[PDB]
Amino acid sequence: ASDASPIAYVNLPQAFVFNVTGDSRDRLVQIKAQLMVRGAENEELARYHSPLIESSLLSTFASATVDQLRSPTGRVELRDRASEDIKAALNAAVGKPVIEKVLFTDFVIQ
Amino acid sequence: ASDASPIAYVNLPQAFVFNVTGDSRDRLVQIKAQLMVRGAENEELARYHSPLIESSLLSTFASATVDQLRSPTGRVELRDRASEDIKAALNAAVGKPVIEKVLFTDFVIQ
């Protein structure tokens, strides 16, 4: 009610920096992320498995193309795929999706 | 009468920087923002859910046009969309809107 929301946020402190390649430009993208989770058990799992979670994120991002990141439909696609990739990796590893979704708090492309 | 509880302002310290591009151009935007809330419980909620709020704001700004930034009508429209997207995110997460509205204290297209 007042004191009872299971929602918590797990900071991912280090920004993700990766190269996206395009027809004229290799570019660097920087993305600051946090994880949204429901409940103390999922929070503990998300903190514990964050090397795995960080590596899932990097793989999703590195697969992105330049005019996917320049397209408003493309950004929503990438955002949702980042969350669903993490859920799939954690389901393989621990049998649980663990997170609700990835949150992106900062995005700069060059 | 609930909407008569006292106003407070929750500062969002980090300015939003994001790219926009289309028929006219490709360039940068900086927005500095704060949240207007009513009452102590909404204020503590706005601070606790700051990762979700910041992510909603970045999502809203990512899907704006360089043409809609140059229109005075579009800028009101952007502000209102931003407030509505935050309220919808928090309604989905805790079942209350939490904020009154978001405030843009700096808005520049450079």
Description:
The structure is a homodimer of 110-residue chains. With 110 residues, chain A is an alpha+beta fold. Chain A has one domain (1-110). Chain A has helices spanning 40-48, 50-62, 66-69, 72-94; strands at 7-11, 16-21, 26-38, 101-108. In chain A, strands 1, 2, 3 and 4 form a four-stranded antiparallel beta sheet that branches. In chain A, β2 (16-21) and β3 (26-38) form a beta hairpin. In chain A, α2 (50-62) runs antiparallel to α4 (72-94). The longest helix of chain A is centred in the C-terminal third of the chain and has 23 residues, at 72-94. The first copy, chain A, is elongated and about 50 Å long. The interface between A and B is medium-sized, with 19 and 17 residues. The PDB classes it as motor protein. The entry lists the keywords Flagellar motor protein, motor protein. It forms a dimeric assembly.
Q: Which band does the percent of strand residues of chain A land in?
A: 25-35%
How many helical stretches of chain A? Answer: 4
Assembly state here?
homodimer
CA-based shape of chain A:
elongated
> How many strand segments of chain A?
4
User: What gyration radius of chain A follows from the Cα positions, in whole Å?
Assistant: 15 Å
Gap from first CA to last CA of chain A: 44 Å
**Tally of individual domains of chain A:** 1
**Mind describing the biggest β-sheet of chain A?**
4 strands, antiparallel
Structural class of chain A: alpha+beta
The ordered string of helix (H) and strand (E) elements of chain A is EEEHHHHE
Percent of residues in helices of chain A: 40-55%
**Largest interface by Cβ-Cβ < 8 Å:** A-B, 19 and 17 residues
PDB class: motor protein
Keywords: Flagellar motor protein, motor protein
Assembly: dimeric
Entry title: Structure of the 58-167 fragment of FliL
